[PDB]
Amino acid sequence: MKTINLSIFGLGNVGLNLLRIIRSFNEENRLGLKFNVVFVADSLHSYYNERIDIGKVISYKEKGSLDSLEYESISASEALARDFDIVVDATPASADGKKELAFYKETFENGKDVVTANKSGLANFWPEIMEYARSNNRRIRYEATVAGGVPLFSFIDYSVLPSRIKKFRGIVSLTINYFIRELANKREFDDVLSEATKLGIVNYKDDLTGLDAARKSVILCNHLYGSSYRLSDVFYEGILDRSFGKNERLVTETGIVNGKPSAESRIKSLDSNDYLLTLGKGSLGYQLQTDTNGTLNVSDLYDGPYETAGAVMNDLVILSM
């Protein structure tokens, strides 16, 4: 009954599952919403139509066959100037966040909101993105940038409204924690890495230096405390010679320390009854300590891109409803 129009940038693990979800949601939902797609782009294609056939785009991407499509081809900038409501950024994260910054600037100025799974602009240029949003009276949500499909920003925004002090501890970076836990099994780094490569588990540098965790901690700290931090404002460390205990994890923590928001990702030996120790190697989870709503433990069972796309979709519904 209410139609919301989208331009989707990126058709990979997240983007392609988002298309599948949008299709099912359109057919099934009890929210009175319909999401129409007017534009899809990947690294090779940039297709516009008043009513993109989503099933066709899915089927042709699955067959490696978007080459075969009839649609208008227009550049990202032209697409932002066409009539629609929301941009979805499911593209690769740049090293410096500049491309994401420029893209959100142009999106906002063209009068559209942003939902992003890409953390790069937010981790490097948060106050600039927020200024461009405010300036243009637009909004951005970023559920999927931290803790994938486990509700986190919607949880903070709608479930614990009365709490003022919130403090966060979590496993939000899985690959480095996989490596730590395997090394704690008394395996050699080279053997863990070799197998992880064959399994598709891991250029693994950003993960294993703790930088992935650091980028997420910027977004989390800024959202929680209204800080305007970038990467240099947070602490992080990684694993790139020593042995690891069974109770060691790279834990990401944010809170107010000495009157100042603080964010850190550190390798710690946890107490044997710590909630975070209970999480499986594929499980994202966190403990959120609040002053009015107690201390809450939240996690999923198995992280994956379908659930991640489901977080993007929750943001899309929040913005629309």
Q: Does 300 bind a second copy (CB under 8 A)?
A: yes
Among 19, 93, 150, 192, binds a second copy (CB under 8 A): 150
CB under 8 A: which stretch of 4-12, 18-26, 106-114, 178-186 binds a second copy? Answer: 18-26
Buried b (16+ CB within 10 A) or exposed e, 132-141: bbeebebbbb
Listed ranges 3-11, 58-66, 260-268, 293-301: which one lies at the site for a second copy (CB under 8 A): 293-301
Rounded Cα distance, 38 and 13, in Å: 20
Enumerate the H helices of 82-239 as residue ranges. Answer: 98-109, 120-135, 153-158, 174-184, 189-198, 205-208, 211-225
Q: What is the DSSP letter of 71?
A: S
Dist. CA 133–CA 113, nearest whole Å: 8
Q: Check: CB of residue 208 under 8 Å from CB of residue 179.
A: yes
- 292 near a second copy, judged by CB under 8 A: yes
Amino acid at 124: N
Angle (CA) 10 11 15, round 5°: 85
Catalytic residue among 98, 167, 216, 281: 216
Q: Is residue 216 among the annotated active site residues?
A: yes
Beta-sheet pairing, 33-41 with 2-9: parallel
- Asked if residue 209 binds a second copy (CB under 8 A), the reply is no
Binding segment for ligand NAD (CB under 6 A), chosen from 89-97, 102-110, 253-261, 284-292, is: 89-97
Q: Which does 91 bind (CB under 5 to 8 A by kind): a second copy, ligand NAD, none?
A: ligand NAD
Residue 48 pairs in a beta bridge with 39, 72
> Does 15 show up as a binding residue in the annotation?
yes
Closest distance between a second copy and the C-beta of residue 26, in Å?
11
The residues that touch ligand NAD, with contacts defined as CB under 6 A, are 9-15, 41-43, 90-93, 117-118, 144, 148, 305, 308
The residues that touch a second copy, with contacts defined as CB under 8 A, are 21, 24-25, 28-31, 149-151, 154-155, 157-164, 226, 278, 285, 290, 292-304, 306-307, 310-311, 313-314, 317-318, 321
Catalytic residues: 216
Q: Residue ranges for the binding site?
A: 10-15, 43, 91, 119, 308
